Design a protein around this ligand. Structure first.
Ligand SMILES: CSc1ccccc1CC(=O)N1CCc2nccc(O)c2C1
Ligand SMILES: [Zn+2]
Length: 140
């Protein structure tokens, strides 16, 4: 579990969105595993606007933040899990690192701010769903 709180938005994995998220929906995209809902209070996270390929992510199954090198956002072939059938997930970045289903949520960050959130893994690999191209998160 885990979310990004920026301005009056809450960014979560689409497959982990609650009824309150769907009842206060701003935007969702199944191909990216992302959903954004509105919040009453303002959040403290800042979104990175960059092309960094090194950062640090939070892994709840280890209670640790790991430094990682990660690929550029791409259309990444992901095998069946409890939530999506094997398919092609877009705007996905991969890194070598430990992860369990429960970790989805965890923030990947660089020197500029939040880059994305865990979205996939297995095989000793993890994927984050990128958010750096969602410029509208910084306003309205
Ligand atoms: C951070 S989510 C996660 C973490 C640890 C393990 C599995 C997942 C779920 C997932 O994404 N799957 C399910 C199984 C799996 N296994 C091997 C190759 C895969 O493509 C997939 C895709
Ligand atoms: Zn950066």
């Amino acid at each position: 579990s885990g979310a990004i709180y920026v301005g009056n938005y809450r960014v979560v994995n689409r497959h982990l969105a609650t009824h309150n998220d769907w009842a206060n929906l701003v935007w969702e995209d199944s191909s990216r595993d992302l959903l954004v809902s509105s919040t009453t209070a303002q959040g403290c996270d800042t979104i990175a606007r960059c092309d960094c390929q090194t950062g640090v992510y939070y892994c709840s199954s280890r209670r640790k933040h790991y430094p990682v090198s990660f690929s550029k956002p791409s259309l990444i072939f992901v095998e069946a899990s409890e939530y999506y059938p094997a398919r092609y997930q877009s705007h996905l970045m991969l890194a070598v690192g430990h992860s369990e289903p429960g970790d989805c949520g965890g923030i990947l960050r660089c020197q500029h701010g939040v880059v994305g959130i865990v979205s996939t893994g297995g095989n000793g690999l993890v994927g984050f769903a990128d958010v750096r191209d969602l410029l509208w998160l910084d306003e309205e």
